[PDB]
């Protein structure tokens, strides 16, 4: 759900930093790393 | 799992002093959960502290309480009188919830003597083969007092029935009742029953009795 | 529009079941978690049950486990709590409470219910008794007069005395009951002005609802006995 | 609704879970299929 | 929990002004449009106001335009409705509405309030008085006997009469009231049996909020006007 | 803007009777936007009919009312006898609300006499100067009722108060009360007065009268 960065803030993010007050540190760092993934993996077939 | 602690379990004062509670923790436990709560008489309790040291809503200026590690407190600073009731303290685990055991306040007057009136038993328990003779003390401070029951000044102490009073917000006295209950034929064995009432505020036990003038 | 209401509760045999609920009203019920504490007589607190909001995580201490059941309903907007094979040290004060933050378990509680007594014991229930009390005499008849009312031999708890329909309540002392040989025993005292009795008439009121008892007494002044 | 990625998580999926346990099934394949798809006809676009 | 009650409203001089409210609660505030409906006194309904859910947007009659106020506040969770240089067609029922589809302005209406009376005239605050009935005689005086409770001479509208507090409740008619020459006058009958009534003794009772006036009145069983 | 008009306004009907209202409009409207409220005695009214053919929650099954284009109409099947009330039929218009006037329906029973029952004034209002003579007519079928003040044969029509009653749910008949006001010199210039009451139901009209018998 994360991924698609459907609700991550509104649902997901926020009621959770509400209790761990540094839980931004491990979701913020995971939307750079898959999304670069997906831009790369879109350039792959484009250069196929 | 965790176990908690309190000291003192009773404890008095008046408006004008300052007052200080504990909850005593037996293992090292961060500051984030934590919680207070007040109970008055019959009264579902209610949050009062969120988080060890930040106040709830409809809360007044005067609380507060702080710490850290193994130790924690509440302080009340200018303690009214509204402020004679029970209170807990919460700590969260691996999956349990822990409360406290009970920490109660009580509010200081002046002293008096007990007031005393005893009562005979009615006709229609008399028809029933009983008796039950009953002693009330009321409008009393403190709540520390001692009764006797003498029958032609025998001290008996079988067959009493006794049970105190939440302290009063009206004057902060204690009241009482001392029942001594009989059967049909040894109520007519005997002349006098009298109940005394001993108490710190007069060396003479006053004493409020019935005969059997007409009974 | 915050409320929570109870339902359940009475007297049960050691040996059976009992299946309260919890009625919840005012916030969105599905976007919380739910549980149960209770409250022993002898004044202090112990944790039974809870469960997160969407209803397939449950917890339990380990002194109750395997026993009791509790699941939740969305649509109904009520919570359910279902016991089975009971024992005596279960007579104590139950409640119903929400947690703080929203989606979470296990922080803080901010809005309870108000109570429902259960008490499983081997007694009997019975009907109480009322007798109506006077004084024997006075020296110099002051106007500090005194009358009591006497409920004994009930089962089980509560009872509900009150002073002609509840007419007065100044001046009045409740007393806690206290239980001998299976039977409850209630006393109550009231100190009126010497020239409002006997001209005003008053009546105790006892009004007993797990019996059924709706016993009502008045004070005679002091009939002597004597017989020609 | 599901295709376009917009509250696909918090409005259709995870109320059907709480009836259905299995449901999941049938809507994550569905986003490796479309998606998939959709960027392929992009690239179509790029080699014209 | 939906629930919509009113306040305000009473008299008011023509050349005056009133401010109305209107309290919602159980639904979510922030989510709806909201709607004042009135009703006429002979038996017709007629629209006042109403507004979308964020406050910006009014909709307004031509017959009343420019005079009334609406407005909104969501943190508060009520409704207002101020109004200045009131007529006198204006002596009506008001109500306060939710719209049925959400974000909606202008389709159906499915909850509403109860009411809440104002009335706009030149007359004068009065006290009324009361005046106990009973019959002259009776032929065979049989078991069938009624009184009556005569109200007249008051203002504004309304008046509460009960029977000893509201004990009895069968076998009376309540008469609407009819308003001449600036004076409301209310009657009332009962009908009891011929056994209860004199043995029985009863009050009219009377409670005038308006003015402040509480008369409480007994029936004297036809005493005759002679005198030595 | 759009007008609404109805037909009838006043019908009445028995348990066992089918019946059907009409709104009719000024006009052409597409059906998406018509509702239907229903008011009982004192009630403030409630939704009825969403869409001009689908129900509300809170609903039998035996309340249906169709069409289209310009006319539109409300029947009931099997009619109890708790839809004697008033009815209203709304429509959207630019940006307007526009109900109708009201379709008010009655339970009828058997016919009956009126109970008559005068009362005379009472003391205290003859130390204040006036007088007032009630008469009472209680539990009546049907509404229609005439009435008269009769003063030594003389037919005053001067000083009369009527008001009528609702429809009572008990029985399905209807109260009245008639007041002759009087002043204190009025009242003693005379002897005898009459109220009588004039039906269908007895070509005779019963006379209830007083005189002044110790009065």
């Known amino acids: 759900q994360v991924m698609t960065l459907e609700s991550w803030s509104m649902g997901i993010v926020r009621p959770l930093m509400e209790v761990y007050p540094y839980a931004w540190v491990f979701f913020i760092p995971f939307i750079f790393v898959v999304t670069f993934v997906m831009i790369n993996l879109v350039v792959a077939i484009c250069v196929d | 799992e965790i176990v908690l602690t309190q000291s003192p379990a009773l404890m008095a004062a008046s408006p004008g002093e300052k007052v200080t509670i504990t909850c005593s923790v037996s293992?090292?436990?961060?500051?984030?959960?934590l919680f207070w709560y007040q109970q008055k008489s019959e009264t579902s309790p209610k949050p009062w502290i969120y988080?060890?040291?930040k106040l709830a809503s409809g809360v007044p200026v005067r609380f507060s309480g702080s710490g850290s590690g193994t130790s924690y407190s509440l302080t009340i600073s200018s303690m009214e009188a509204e402020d004679a009731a029970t209170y807990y303290c919460?700590?969260?685990?691996?999956?349990?919830?822990?409360f406290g055991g009970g920490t109660k306040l009580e509010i200081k007057r002046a002293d008096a003597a007990p007031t005393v009136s005893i009562f005979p038993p009615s006709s229609e328990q008399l028809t029933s083969g009983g008796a039950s003779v009953v002693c009330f003390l009321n409008n009393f401070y403190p709540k520390d007092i001692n009764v006797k029951w003498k029958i032609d000044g025998s001290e008996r102490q079988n067959g009493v029935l006794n049970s105190w009073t939440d302290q009063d917000s009206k004057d902060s006295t204690y009241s009482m009742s001392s029942t001594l209950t009989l059967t049909k034929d040894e109520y007519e064995r005997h002349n006098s029953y009298t109940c005394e009432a001993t108490h710190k505020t007069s060396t003479s036990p006053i004493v409020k009795s019935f005969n059997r003038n007409e009974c | 529009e915050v409320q929570l209401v109870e339902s359940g509760g009475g007297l049960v045999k050691p040996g059976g079941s009992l299946k309260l609920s919890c009625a919840a009203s005012?916030?969105?019920?599905?976007?919380?978690?739910m549980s149960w504490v209770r409250q022993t007589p002898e004044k202090r607190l112990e944790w039974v049950a809870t469960?997160?909001?969407?209803?397939?995580?449950?917890y339990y201490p380990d002194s109750v486990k395997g026993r009791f059941t509790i699941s939740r309903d969305n649509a109904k907007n009520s919570l359910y709590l279902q016991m089975s094979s009971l024992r005596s040290e279960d007579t104590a004060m139950y409640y119903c409470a929400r947690h703080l933050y929203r989606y979470d378990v296990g922080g803080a509680l901010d809005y309870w219910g108000q109570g429902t007594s259960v008490t499983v014991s081997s007694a009997k229930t019975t009907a109480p008794s009322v007798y109506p009390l006077a004084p024997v005499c006075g020296d110099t008849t002051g106007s500090s007069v005194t009358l009591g009312c006497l409920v004994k031999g009930y089962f089980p708890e509560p009872v509900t005395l009150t002073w002609n329909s509840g007419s007065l309540s100044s001046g009045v002392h409740t007393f806690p009951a206290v239980l001998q040989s299976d039977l409850y025993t209630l006393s109550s005292s009231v100190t009126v002005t010497s020239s409002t009795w006997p001209s005003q008439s008053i009546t105790c009121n006892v009004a007993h609802p797990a019996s059924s008892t709706k016993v009502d007494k008045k004070i005679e002044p002091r009939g002597p006995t004597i017989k020609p | 609704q599901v295709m376009t990625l917009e509250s696909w998580s918090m409005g259709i999926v995870r109320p059907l879970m709480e009836v259905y346990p299995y449901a999941w099934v049938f809507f994550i394949p569905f986003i490796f299929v479309v998606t998939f798809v959709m960027i392929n006809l992009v690239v179509a676009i790029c080699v014209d | 929990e939906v629930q919509l009650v009113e306040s305000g409203g009473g008299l008011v001089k023509p050349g005056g002004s009133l401010k109305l409210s209107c309290?919602?609660?159980?639904?979510?505030?922030?989510?709806?449009?909201?709607?004042?409906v009135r009703q006429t006194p002979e038996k017709r309904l007629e629209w006042?106001?109403?507004?979308?859910?964020?406050?910006?947007?009014?909709?307004?009659?031509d017959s009343v335009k420019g005079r009334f106020t609406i407005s909104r506040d969501n943190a508060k969770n009520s409704l207002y409705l101020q109004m200045s240089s009131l007529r006198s067609e204006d002596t009506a029922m008001y109500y306060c509405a939710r719209h049925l589809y959400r974000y909606d302005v202008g389709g159906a209406l499915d909850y509403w309030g109860q009411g809440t009376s104002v009335t706009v005239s030149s007359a004068k605050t009065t006290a009324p008085s009361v005046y106990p009935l009973a019959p002259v005689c009776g032929d065979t005086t049989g078991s069938s006997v009624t009184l009556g409770c005569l109200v007249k001479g008051y203002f504004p509208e309304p008046v509460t009469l009960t029977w000893n507090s509201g004990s009895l409740s069968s076998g009376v008619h309540t008469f609407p009231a009819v308003l001449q020459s600036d004076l409301y006058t209310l009657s009332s009958s009962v009908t009891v049996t011929s056994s209860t009534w004199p043995s029985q003794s009863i009050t009219c009772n009377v409670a005038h909020p308006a003015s402040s006036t509480k008369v409480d009145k007994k029936i004297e069983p036809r005493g005759p006007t002679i005198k030595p | 803007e759009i007008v609404l008009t109805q037909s009838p306004a006043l019908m009445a009907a028995s348990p066992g009777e089918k019946v059907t209202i009409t709104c009719?409009?000024?006009?052409?409207?597409?059906?998406?936007?018509?509702?239907?409220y229903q008011q009982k005695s004192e009630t403030s009214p409630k939704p009825?009919?969403?869409?001009?053919?689908?129900?509300?929650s809170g609903v039998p099954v035996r309340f249906s009312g169709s069409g289209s284009g310009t006319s539109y109409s409300l029947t009931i099947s099997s009619m109890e006898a708790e839809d004697a009330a008033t009815?209203?039929?709304?429509?959207?218009?630019?940006?307007?609300?526009?109900?109708?006037?009201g379709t008010k329906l009655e339970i009828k029973r058997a016919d009956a006499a009126p109970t008559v029952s005068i009362f005379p004034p009472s003391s205290e209002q003859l130390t204040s100067g006036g007088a007032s003579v009630v008469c009472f007519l209680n539990n009546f079928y049907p509404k229609d009722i005439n009435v008269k003040w009769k003063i030594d044969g003389s037919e005053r029509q001067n000083g009369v108060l009527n008001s009528w009653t609702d429809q009572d749910s008990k029985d399905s008949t209807y109260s009245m009360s008639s007041t002759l006001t009087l002043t204190k010199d009025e009242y003693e210039r005379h002897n005898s007065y009459t109220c009588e009451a004039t039906h269908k139901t007895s070509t005779s009209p019963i006379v209830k009268s007083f005189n002044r018998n110790e009065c």
């Open positions: 293992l090292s436990i961060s500051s984030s959960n």
């Open positions: 919460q700590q969260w685990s691996s999956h349990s919830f822990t």
């Open positions: 005012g916030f969105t019920f599905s976007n919380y978690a």
């Open positions: 988080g060890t040291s």
């Open positions: 469960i997160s909001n969407g209803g397939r995580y449950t």
